[PDB]
C-alpha cells in the first residue's frame, strides 16, 4: 500500500472543449449565487433554522 508522492500540477495552459468539458460535467458549475451571500444587514432565515 504505497502513498502518492507530494507532487501537484505543473502549470495550466489548456482550456475550452479540451478541459472545459470535465469542468462542466463532473465539476459542474453550481449556482455560485444566492447560496454564498450572507446579507450581513438582514436575516433571511429563522434564528435557529440552521
Amino acid at each position: 500500500k504505497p502513498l502518492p508522492a507530494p507532487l501537484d500540477g505543473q502549470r495550466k495552459k489548456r482550456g475550452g472543449r479540451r478541459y472545459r468539458k470535465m469542468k462542466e460535467r463532473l465539476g459542474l458549475t453550481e449556482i455560485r449565487k444566492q447560496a454564498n451571500r450572507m446579507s450581513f444587514g438582514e436575516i433571511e432565515e429563522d434564528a435557529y433554522q440552521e
Binding site: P2, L3, A5
Partner: protein, 141 residues
C-alpha cells in the same frame, strides 16, 4: 523489533543525511530503552511502509552517538528531528521551538500528515514548514 535501521556511528548518520536528497530524512534520537521511544518506534513502524516512497526514517541512540545530543542539544527522552538535503527543516508545531517534536505522537494519521507537510515545505524550500496542527496544546478534551 525497530525495523528502522539505527545509524550507530554519528558520521554514518551524517552521511545518511547526505545520502538521500529527494526525500525526507527523519532521525529518532530517542534511546530505545525508554517506553516513550518505544511508542515513537511503533508510530514509525505504522508509517514505515507508507511514507517510505516519500521519506527515509532512521533511528538513533544518543548513547551510541553522543555528538548529535551535544551539538544539536537534543535533551528530550525521544525527540524527532528532520533534515532535508543538509537543511534541518523546522516544523511550526508552536511549542516555543521547532527543532524537535518532543511528543510521543500516538496518532499514525497525524504523523503521516506531518511528514507530508514537511515534504511539501522542503520542496517549497521553506525552512520553517507551517505544521497543519495545533501542537501548542494537548489536543485532548
Amino acid at each position: 523489533s525497530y525495523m528502522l535501521p539505527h545509524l550507530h556511528n554519528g558520521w554514518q548518520v551524517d552521511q545518511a543525511i547526505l545520502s538521500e536528497e529527494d526525500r525526507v530524512v527523519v532521525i529518532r534520537f530517542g534511546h530505545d530503552w525508554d517506553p516513550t521511544c518505544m511508542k515513537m518506534d511503533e508510530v514509525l513502524y505504522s508509517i514505515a511502509e507508507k511514507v517510505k516512497n516519500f521519506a527515509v526514517i532512521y533511528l538513533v541512540d544518543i548513547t551510541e552517538v553522543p555528538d548529535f545530543n551535544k551539538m544539536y542539544e537534543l535533551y528530550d527522552p525521544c525527540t524527532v528531528m528532520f533534515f532535508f538535503r543538509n537543511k534541518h527543516i523546522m516544523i511550526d508545531l508552536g511549542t516555543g521551538n521547532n527543532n524537535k517534536i518532543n511528543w510521543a505522537m500516538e496518532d499514525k494519521q497525524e504523523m503521516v500528515d506531518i511528514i507530508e507537510t514537511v515534504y511539501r515545505g522542503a520542496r517549497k524550500g521553506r525552512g520553517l514548514v507551517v505544521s497543519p496542527k495545533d501542537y501548542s496544546t494537548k489536543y485532548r478534551y
